[PDB]
Amino acid sequence: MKPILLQGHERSITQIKYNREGDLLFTVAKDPIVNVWYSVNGERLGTYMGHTGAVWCVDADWDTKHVLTGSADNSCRLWDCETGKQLALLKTNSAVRTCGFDFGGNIIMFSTFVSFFDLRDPSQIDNNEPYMKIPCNDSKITSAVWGPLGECIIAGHESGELNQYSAKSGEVLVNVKEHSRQINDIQLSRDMTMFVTASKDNTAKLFDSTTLEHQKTFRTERPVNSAALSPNYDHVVLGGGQEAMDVTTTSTRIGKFEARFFHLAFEEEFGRVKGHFGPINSVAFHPDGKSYSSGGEDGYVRIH
Amino acid sequence: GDVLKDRPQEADGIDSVIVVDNVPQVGPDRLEKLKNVIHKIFSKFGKITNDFYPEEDGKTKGYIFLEYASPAHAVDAVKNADGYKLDKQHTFRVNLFTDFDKYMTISDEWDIPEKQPFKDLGNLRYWLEEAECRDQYSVIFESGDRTSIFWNDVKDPVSIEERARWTETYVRWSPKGTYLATFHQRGIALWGGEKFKQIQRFSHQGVQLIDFSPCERYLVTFSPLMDTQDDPQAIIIWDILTGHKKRGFHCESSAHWPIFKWSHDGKFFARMTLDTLSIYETPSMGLLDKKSLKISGIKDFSWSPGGNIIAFWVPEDKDIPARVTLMQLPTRQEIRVRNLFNVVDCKLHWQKNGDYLCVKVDRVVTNFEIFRMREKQVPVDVVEMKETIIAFAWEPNGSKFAVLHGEAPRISVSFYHVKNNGKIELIKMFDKQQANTIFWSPQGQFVVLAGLRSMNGALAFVDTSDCTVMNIAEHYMASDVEWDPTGRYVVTSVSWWSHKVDNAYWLWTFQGRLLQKNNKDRFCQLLWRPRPPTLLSQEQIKQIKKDLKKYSKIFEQKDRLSQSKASKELVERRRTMMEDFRKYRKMA
Amino acid sequence: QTIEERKERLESLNIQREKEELEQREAELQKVRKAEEERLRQEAKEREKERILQEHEQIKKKTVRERLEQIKKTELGAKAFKDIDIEDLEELDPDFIMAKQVEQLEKEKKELQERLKNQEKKIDYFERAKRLEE
């Protein structure tokens, strides 16, 4: 197949997630305009522009209806998909860095602290504020997201740490030194019952969420920032633009960022497809098992 | 003039003297008759000044020698006027000073050398050598943006040769796979080979349609654009092999283009001009002096596909029965006349060995007329069907045939056989199908009992040795159905040029089931290129026709090994990488 | 003492005659015991038998009431178990053998192609001869 890459942004794409039906992919980006694209054929429906700073994250709900962006502009934004009009505006005190929905839509995660946000749809309110904050404990949480039905939260951290959250007590459990660098993105599995964390420390991992034992490492010779689990197919994606394991990393004119095909359980790389023009910043997979996604420093999402 | 072989000078001549043909000759009363008709040759020479009448030693002359006020205006003189008022026997001719010993230039001294062999090596020779199947079908994607010639798709290869703008307009392959033809504004290109090299190119600006002679002497080109080089025409004929122009021909009404029908062997051809026949012999592009091939009052015609016999259908006159005609090709005499009454419509259906002809007679009681052409005196067996036949299909090369009749929800398939003892039989009825089309395998039995089925796969299959349904293809894409020339592939495909529910070509086995599909971007035309069987040895064909048992070697394991080796580890290096990939599926 | 003598005997006479009558009086009570016994034994057989006989008839009656084969064992009339098994046998074995036969003929075309492959080199000899003929 043909991958349609849309490069409608002049600054870095920041997070990708596919929706449940997957005809839409939701993306927020380092340029103040987030964007919503039809994933089926790559036509861009529109852009989400009510933010005034880099929007770090987006995730699309279980209904595939609305997309939201969170930003460093001191705001959190919920967006109308038909016209891109800001209908309400909420201020935030910090950048929201990673997003991932609870399975029921009644709860939402936010990465600040580790924030927990309730959505009480019965009350006609998308809350301006998070419903809970888990404050930091010796480090800083770069990325965080809510597992299935809000049961556990899996966070990857700037210090190479992993964190674990107890939904019934609302707090963080423990970390271990593993990696040497910042976590750039985090996206949940398709059923959200287990999760993988990612970091820019040149290691990628497949991890159990439930035990916190290091279960698996997925190898590329490049730091991977984002992966998503595809419905209809058992896959892992490994990602870099610049090789990321040398100083003075350099690119070719062609665009050396390549889509990499991996086994989710068994971990091996079996081939590559080039085409993206930056480090992978974001990844989403189609609900039909038909696509994978790369987020570039050029701002594009490519669905393949 | 008076001479039974009268002609003028054979070339243009000296510039200073005018030649007048049918001129104002010496002698009483004959002179003033062409006094003006030779003032045609001399009228655009200015005022005619002297037109001296030469006499051919006192016999009555047709020609005189002429001069003008300007000598060098003779080149102008013979174009601005012809046919000035005339009496007696002279009119309409002009020239310059009676030139002679004319000359012609033409290709000579044939040596084939270069350009003879790329086309031939690729197909029907390498094809026979090739051991895979699916007929090495070519490929067309995105309306000629990518044009591909391909090898057999059962094996690892698909694509044999692919080029951009190889075929700007549509596609065409020859009936034996030797050539592939392409259409373009500048003309036609013939393509052939494993690498699909250019075989022949015919430069013909704005050619709108083409055909190729069965024996490859002639290329037929049809255009709605008219050219004037040959007589007023909208159709060019080219020699296909050499690129040489053989003939040009007029078309009065371009309704359909099977205008030049060919003999079974391709040796002779027939062509209609309105209600008149013009016969061009296929071998020579020559007129047939056979009396029937200039016949008046025929109304429809076609050839035998295996016997070279001519057939004519003439609808019934007010008092005289309609009559079907069998004219042999050279003797031109009647072997069989079929007079029947109350005929409404007639369609001619031939069998592929040319042993039998079925006439579909409409009387409404449809009648089939089956002619035992091989048995002496051609006895005709009539099959009286009763219920509105909508299809007929012969068993290829056999004495069995298949028909479809009736209402679409209750359409009945009936398979028929003709026997050595004369008596016809219905072998089996297969009722209540949606079939309206038949694509039999070239090898016999495998008759595709299936309708158009466009976007609604209602296709079915009937084999004819046992009247058994082998397999069903549910392909919505299928709209056309054809079997490979080898008889080992039946392709069900869809055209994005035609419709938009599928856009692909599927390469399948002729057994009866679609295997897998290679999608085509706009699917202008997808066709199995022919691997047409030219010949066989009966003794080699007989009994086992293998080296040992089944097919060739008794083991037949030479190609069978690949399935188990490649699946576990395709090349060992590819394996360890990709072994994980679907180890993951089960485990995760 | 004649008057004195008569009185003493009278007490003895009165007591003895009464006591003998008392013995007779006791006997009548005893006779009643024999009288009571007769009715009971007849009734015992009768009471059990009367209830049982109607019950025996009624219990048989109840069963006979339902002795009708209400389930007539002809509800559908197919009575099929082995019917589904026998069809499965003819089709499955035949298809494999036929397909193998089909494959064999299909394979044979490649084998015919092998006979054709000798001809295929021959065809290039024809190709050579035609180019040579020139």
Short mmCIF file of C-alpha atoms in Angstrom, two decimals, chain A residues 234 262-271, chain B residues 576-578 580-585 587-588:
data_model
loop_
_atom_site.label_atom_id
_atom_site.label_comp_id
_atom_site.label_asym_id
_atom_site.label_seq_id
_atom_site.Cartn_x
_atom_site.Cartn_y
_atom_site.Cartn_z
CA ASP A 234 -0.48 -7.87 16.91
CA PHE A 262 8.06 -5.77 14.59
CA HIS A 263 6.45 -8.69 16.44
CA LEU A 264 4.51 -7.60 19.54
CA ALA A 265 5.16 -10.77 21.57
CA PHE A 266 8.35 -12.07 19.95
CA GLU A 267 10.18 -8.72 19.30
CA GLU A 268 12.05 -9.09 16.02
CA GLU A 269 12.48 -6.54 13.23
CA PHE A 270 11.73 -7.99 9.79
CA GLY A 271 11.96 -5.08 7.32
CA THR B 576 14.85 -15.31 11.70
CA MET B 577 13.73 -11.70 11.21
CA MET B 578 10.12 -12.50 10.20
CA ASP B 580 8.85 -13.63 15.28
CA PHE B 581 6.10 -11.67 13.42
CA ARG B 582 3.45 -14.40 13.45
CA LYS B 583 4.93 -16.20 16.42
CA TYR B 584 3.62 -13.04 18.10
CA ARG B 585 0.01 -13.50 16.81
CA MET B 587 1.29 -16.00 21.76
CA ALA B 588 0.06 -12.43 22.33
#
